[PDB]
From a paper:
Cerdulatinib and lestaurtinib displayed potent inhibition of all JAK family members. Binding of these pan-JAK inhibitors stabilizes a closed G-loop structure, where Asn859 from the G-loop and Asp994 from the DFG motif are within hydrogen-bonding distance. Lestaurtinib forms hydrogen bonds with the carbonyl oxygen of Glu930 and the backbone amide of Leu932 at the hinge and also makes a direct hydrogen bond with Arg980 next to the catalytic loop and water-mediated hydrogen bonds to Asp994, Asn981, Ser936, and Asp939. The binding of momelotinib, ilginatinib, cerdulatinib, and lestaurtinib is mainly driven by enthalpy. Accordingly, the highest desolvation free-energy gain, arising from the displacement of waters upon inhibitor binding, was observed with compounds occupying the front pocket and not extending toward the G-loop or toward the solvent (lestaurtinib and gandotinib). Gandotinib, pacritinib, and lestaurtinib, which make a water-mediated hydrogen bond to Asp939, could directly interact with the glutamate in this position in JAK1. In line with this concept, gandotinib and lestaurtinib showed no selectivity over JAK1. The compounds also inhibited the catalytic activity of [name] in vitro with low-nanomolar IC50 values, and the most potent inhibition was observed by ilginatinib, lestaurtinib, and ruxolitinib.
Numbering used by the authors: 833 to 1132
The structure:
């Protein structure tokens, strides 16, 4: 009460934050490209700005937690927090981040196959694992690992990007039980996430296996996890029947197929991440080491 705590409201003043264009839609909000030009001389820094799509009291509270999460993270493979803009005369909140020119990893794989080979895919895989190791040290569960939520700075560097679903583990437990679910990326979910609403570092590892799958399909049409799972379930199915069949499929060892051209060793990593036994999944530290040893064990 007596003394409130707030980010520096003069760091990014709304009157110097110039809207350039929309960048995309993410968890609970949208992202725009702006220029922050306090010397109004057509210089300044380009930045990315996240804003809520539905500014309810609950969503604003969740957004504050998301902002605090990102601000607490400093890592080469996590998108950089820059600050907050208290816009609308300090009666609104927007998140300011660094601008990463190539957008989502999902879109980069589709648009820039000319400069992607397996060496680059393994490099991105390694970087993703290291960012996830770092999140683990803060007891953060990302909860939406997918190439749509990873960002590309340049052909040599990717960064985990969208923290809209991220949760902090309770102090006394190794999982977070979500008790108000909204829109769920079910084709990235671990089985215990589908059946018990339990999220953990190990469920992030499951989803990382789907990310690895995505990388090695090169976002080829018809190979995405939704398209492949729907092909296995039956493209006709609708509503909850889809979830029922997905759960039944995963519990009895149905899995995404090996992508064309994917080495058996990379597919085996995917398979080990996709273990119904939560405790037997590898750690992100195991995965970073194994992937970097594979990379290092090539000639050169
Ligand atoms: C919504 C989304 O818009 C596109 C990619 C994206 O993640 C959607 O796939 N998107 C871009 C498309 C083309 C160029 C740049 C971006 C971009 C950026 C960010 C984000 C970001 C941060 C937090 C949540 C979502 C974010 N996006 C971002 C984003 C953060 N910094 C960015 O440069």
């Amino acid at each position: 009460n007596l003394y409130f705590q707030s980010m520096d409201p003069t760091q990014f003043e709304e009157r110097h934050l110039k809207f350039l264009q929309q960048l995309g839609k993410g968890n609970f909000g949208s992202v725009e490209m702006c220029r922050y030009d306090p010397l109004q001389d057509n210089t300044g820094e380009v930045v990315a700005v996240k804003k809520l799509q539905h500014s309810t009291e609950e969503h604003l509270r969740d957004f504050e937690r998301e902002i605090e999460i990102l601000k607490s993270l400093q890592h080469d493979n996590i998108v950089k927090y820059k600050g907050v803009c208290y816009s609308a005369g300090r009666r609104n909140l927007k998140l300011i981040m660094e601008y990463l020119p190539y957008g989502s990893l999902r879109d980069y794989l589709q648009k820039h196959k000319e400069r992607i080979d397996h060496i680059k895919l393994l490099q991105y895989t390694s970087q993703i694992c290291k960012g996830m190791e770092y999140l683990g040290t803060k007891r953060y569960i990302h909860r939406d690992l997918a190439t749509r939520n990873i960002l590309v700075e340049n052909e040599n560097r990717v960064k985990i990007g969208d923290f809209g679903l991220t949760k902090v583990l309770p102090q006394d437990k190794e999982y977070y039980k979500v008790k108000e679910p909204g829109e769920s990326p079910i084709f990235w979910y671990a089985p215990e996430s589908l059946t018990e609403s339990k999220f953990s570092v190990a469920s992030d590892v499951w989803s990382f296996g789907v990310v690895l799958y995505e990388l090695f399909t090169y976002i080829e049409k018809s190979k995405s996890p939704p398209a492949e799972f729907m092909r296995m379930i039956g493209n006709d199915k609708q509503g909850q029947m889809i979830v029922f069949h997905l759960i039944e499929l995963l519990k009895n060892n149905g899995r995404l197929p090996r992508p064309d051209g994917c080495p058996d060793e990379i597919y085996m990593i995917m398979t080990e991440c996709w273990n119904n036994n939560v405790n037997q999944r590898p750690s992100f530290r195991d995965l970073a080491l194994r992937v970097d040893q594979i990379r290092d064990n090539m000639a050169g």
